[PDB]
Design a protein around this ligand. Structure first.
Ligand SMILES: [Mg+2]
Ligand SMILES: [Mg+2]
Ligand SMILES: [Mg+2]
Ligand SMILES: [Mg+2]
Ligand SMILES: [Mg+2]
Ligand SMILES: [Mg+2]
Ligand SMILES: [Mg+2]
Ligand SMILES: [Mg+2]
Ligand SMILES: [Mg+2]
Ligand SMILES: [Mg+2]
Ligand SMILES: [Mg+2]
Ligand SMILES: [Mg+2]
Ligand SMILES: [Mg+2]
Ligand SMILES: [Mg+2]
Ligand SMILES: [Mg+2]
Ligand SMILES: [Mg+2]
Ligand SMILES: [Mg+2]
Ligand SMILES: [Mg+2]
Ligand SMILES: [Mg+2]
Ligand SMILES: [Mg+2]
Ligand SMILES: [Mg+2]
Ligand SMILES: [Mg+2]
Ligand SMILES: [Mg+2]
Ligand SMILES: [Mg+2]
Ligand SMILES: [Mg+2]
Ligand SMILES: [Mg+2]
Ligand SMILES: [Mg+2]
Ligand SMILES: [Mg+2]
Ligand SMILES: [Mg+2]
Ligand SMILES: [Mg+2]
Ligand SMILES: [Mg+2]
Ligand SMILES: [Mg+2]
Ligand SMILES: [Mg+2]
Ligand SMILES: [Mg+2]
Ligand SMILES: [Mg+2]
Ligand SMILES: [Mg+2]
Ligand SMILES: [Mg+2]
Ligand SMILES: [Mg+2]
Ligand SMILES: [Mg+2]
Lengths: 155, 73, 119
RNA sequence: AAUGCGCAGAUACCGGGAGGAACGCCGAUGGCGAAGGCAGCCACCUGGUCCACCCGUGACGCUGAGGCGCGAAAGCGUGGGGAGCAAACCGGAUUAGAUACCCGGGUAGUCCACGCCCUAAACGAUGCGCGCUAGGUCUCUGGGUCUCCUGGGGGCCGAAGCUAACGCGUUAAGCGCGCCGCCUGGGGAGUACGGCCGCAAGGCUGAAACUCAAAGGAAUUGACGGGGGCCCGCACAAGCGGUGGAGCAUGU
């Protein structure tokens, strides 16, 4: 983006929850253009979020995304010295992306064999406060407020 | 731009050589003891030269400060 | 356990560290603090965050001599100067008045080379 | 960062004392001086200068080889002083190396008196004096009828004009006259020799053999800068997927 501030694209809502976040998730879950079996996963995951919990899946998926969104992160900075890890705020746009990406990645670390299950358990575990996704978020924010000394480079 | 209240104005019939007229002299220092510039005294090239010598004398008598302390920050 | 209530805060600002001394109304220190006292080491003691803690630490330490009211006397050119004040204010301690008292010669001692370049 | 200082209690803060050096603001776009150079305040002793009056003298003028005196800093001698700062030096870092830049120390010195030294980018790189040749404008300092006139000084822009150009232009680098100093291609070389001066360091004065075909001024177009400003590109950043590891294909 050297010229224009570059706008975000508007993913068409889900076919089953009529939601935008759920397309976003489904898109991050998808690889090699196989969108059919990315949705075939997220939904299989959704059946599992109920037959393991009295809660409705959308409310849980949304609930867990919020628990993974990072209020602070560092991004490095070259100064009149070297690399300084400046603690930055995190835009609501970037928290979206970071959360979702982290959720899939965390999910695919898991030892469960079916994909839907891994997504399911990560989606659940993250709602209930725990799980690898959240750990690389409570972690991220821990590097901020540790480099707090360099907050005075707020950009 | 670069102009508020001028000091030659706020007063009237004074002697610039009177090094005892503290009540008049002191109008010419900042909040700190610092002697104000011409752009604020409003004195002419000369008047200022004579007042600075006057203020200096009045500092040695202990009537005017040499330096004071800023009070906001 | 002296009990004082009213006292003075001397912020000593510098491009290298920040040191906050709290004293009684005569000027004798009740307590002090600085970037090094809050366990920082090198360049980070000049950092204004440090200065915030350094003031907050020095506060609390004195807020247990029953201080409440402080006259602030800033005395340095450096970074973390105003932030040391910010910290002092936000510590409940009533700041009764802030004064800059940075000492300056009427041109007197030949400065270190580092600090003169063109005199 | 580390030498370093700190539990023999530093740093920070308050009170008292000692000392040495410099004089913030005013203060600069300013003033004074022949130049070097001159800045807290008071007094004394001294130098130059500018205005008005149009009073006195009556060409008593200008320049000036040599002479004499002055002459930043550093340096030297004798004595004193010594806060801060600091060649040399002693350490710590940095680096390929680091006899450096950065950091902690630190002697001479920087200070004062007296006596030397006599140099400089001692620069406006512009000898002094006098006359003449549009103006505008800002400023310092006098005087008169004080919206304005009239001196002396400091800047800027500009008439004519000058200049290789840059630029100069009533504070000439214009137009003239007087007098002094100096130049005559680069190197060798401010060197050698001699002389004069100096306590010394050194200073003045100042060549030749030899060697080169340039050395050099200003300006033009570019290119370049680890110079500025402005701006692009999957250039970086944000992101997805890779190569680099394996086996094989293929080119080298
Ligand atoms: Mg030790
Ligand atoms: Mg002990
Ligand atoms: Mg001390
Ligand atoms: Mg003391
Ligand atoms: Mg002593
Ligand atoms: Mg002059
Ligand atoms: Mg000069
Ligand atoms: Mg006189
Ligand atoms: Mg007559
Ligand atoms: Mg006659
Ligand atoms: Mg003469
Ligand atoms: Mg001399
Ligand atoms: Mg000397
Ligand atoms: Mg000596
Ligand atoms: Mg001696
Ligand atoms: Mg001695
Ligand atoms: Mg040193
Ligand atoms: Mg030193
Ligand atoms: Mg002498
Ligand atoms: Mg001479
Ligand atoms: Mg002439
Ligand atoms: Mg007048
Ligand atoms: Mg004039
Ligand atoms: Mg002058
Ligand atoms: Mg012309
Ligand atoms: Mg000519
Ligand atoms: Mg021309
Ligand atoms: Mg001109
Ligand atoms: Mg000559
Ligand atoms: Mg020849
Ligand atoms: Mg020659
Ligand atoms: Mg020589
Ligand atoms: Mg000789
Ligand atoms: Mg001899
Ligand atoms: Mg040239
Ligand atoms: Mg260029
Ligand atoms: Mg990239
Ligand atoms: Mg391979
Ligand atoms: Mg071949």
């Amino acid at each position: 983006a050297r010229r224009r501030r570059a706008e975000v694209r508007q993913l068409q809502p889900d076919l089953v929850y009529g939601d935008v976040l759920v397309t976003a998730f489904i898109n991050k879950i998808m690889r090699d253009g196989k969108k059919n079996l990315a949705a075939r996963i997220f939904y299989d995951a959704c059946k599992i979020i109920q037959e393991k919990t009295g809660q409705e899946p959308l409310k849980v998926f949304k609930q867990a995304v919020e628990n993974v969104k990072p209020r602070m992160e560092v991004r490095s900075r070259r100064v009149g010295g070297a690399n300084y890890q400046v603690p930055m705020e995190v835009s609501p746009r970037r928290q979206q992306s970071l959360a979702l990406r982290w959720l899939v990645q965390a999910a695919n670390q898991r030892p469960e064999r079916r994909a839907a299950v891994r997504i399911a358990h990560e989606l659940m575990d993250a709602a209930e406060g725990k799980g690898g996704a959240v750990k690389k978020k409570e972690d991220v924010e821990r590097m901020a407020e540790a480099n707090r000394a360099y907050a005075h480079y707020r950009w | 731009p670069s102009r508020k209240a001028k000091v030659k104005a706020t007063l009237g019939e004074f002697d610039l050589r009177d090094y005892r007229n503290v009540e008049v002299l002191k109008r010419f220092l900042s909040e700190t003891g610092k002697i104000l510039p011409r752009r604020r005294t409003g004195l002419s090239g000369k008047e200022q030269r004579i007042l600075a010598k006057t203020i200096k004398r009045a500092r040695i008598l202990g009537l005017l400060p040499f330096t004071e302390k800023l009070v906001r920050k | 356990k002296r009990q004082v209530a009213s006292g003075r805060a001397y912020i000593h600002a510098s491009y290298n560290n920040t040191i906050v001394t709290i004293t009684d109304p005569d000027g004798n220190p009740i307590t002090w603090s600085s970037g090094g006292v809050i366990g920082y080491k090198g360049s980070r003691k000049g950092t204004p965050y440090a200065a915030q803690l350094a003031a907050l630490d020095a506060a609390k330490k004195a807020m247990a001599y029953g201080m409440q009211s402080v006259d602030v006397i800033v005395r340095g050119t450096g970074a973390g100067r105003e932030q040391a004040i910010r910290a002092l204010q936000a510590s409940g301690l009533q700041v009764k008045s802030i004064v800059d008292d940075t000492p300056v010669p009427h041109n007197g001692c030949r400065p270190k080379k580092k600090f003169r370049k063109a005199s």
